[PDB]
Amino acid sequence: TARGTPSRFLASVLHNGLGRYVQQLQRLSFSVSRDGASSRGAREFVEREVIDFARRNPGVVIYVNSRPCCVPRVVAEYLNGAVREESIHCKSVEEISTLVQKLADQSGLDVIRIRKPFHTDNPSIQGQWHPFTNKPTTFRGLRPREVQDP
């Protein structure tokens, strides 16, 4: 629940998109297996999809390591120092491609509750409301029940 989990506000890394857009994904590391039956989808993805993804994302370093492992894995590292590890155990090539695209599109910020669906550093233009905003003024600034020039 919200009370049992952390929370944050909507934000971005170095105002991404204000001047230019920088892909926050930096590194993808795949650990796959050669003979493991649970790595068939990972092997197919490495065979026929990873090259196209690398072409489409020149700014992401992709490492592939074929080592004995029961659970094939993918690790995503983003420019802000965040590291996310996901499992591709018994996932088809389409599912792996969708997961990789989702990781590429994600900004790297922690996936937790966001308090507000909007963010702004200049909330007001005409002036934030204060109790004297709509109140008029009095000649010589006399308070109620005050006698002028005593």
Please state the closest distance from residue 43 (CB atom) to another protein, in A: 19
Smaller CB separation from another protein, 132 or 139: 132
Measured between alpha carbons, how far is 33 from 12 in angstroms, rounded to an integer? Answer: 36
Residue among 130 and 145 whose Cβ is closer to another protein: 130
CB-wise, 55 or 111, nearer to another protein? 55
Query: Shortest approach of another protein to residue 4 CB, angstroms?
Result: 19
Q: How far is the CB of 33 from another protein (least distance, A)?
A: 17
> Tokens 């109790």 map to which residue?
131
Q: How many Å separate Cα 99 from the centre of its chain?
A: 15
Binding site for another protein (CB under 8 A): 13-15, 18-20, 22-23, 26-27, 29, 58-61, 63, 65, 79-81, 118, 120-126, 130-132, 137, 141, 143
User: Whats the size of the chain, residue-wise?
Assistant: 150
Give the DSSP letter string of 73-108. Answer: EEEEEETTS-EEEEE-TT--HHHHHHHHHHHHHS-S
CA 44 – CA 55 distance, rounded (Å): 17
Helix (H, G, I), strand (E, B) or coil at 8: strand
Structure-token match 């005593």, residue found: 150
Query: CB of 22: closest distance to another protein in angstroms?
Result: 6
Shorter beta-carbon distance to another protein: residue 7 or 92: 7
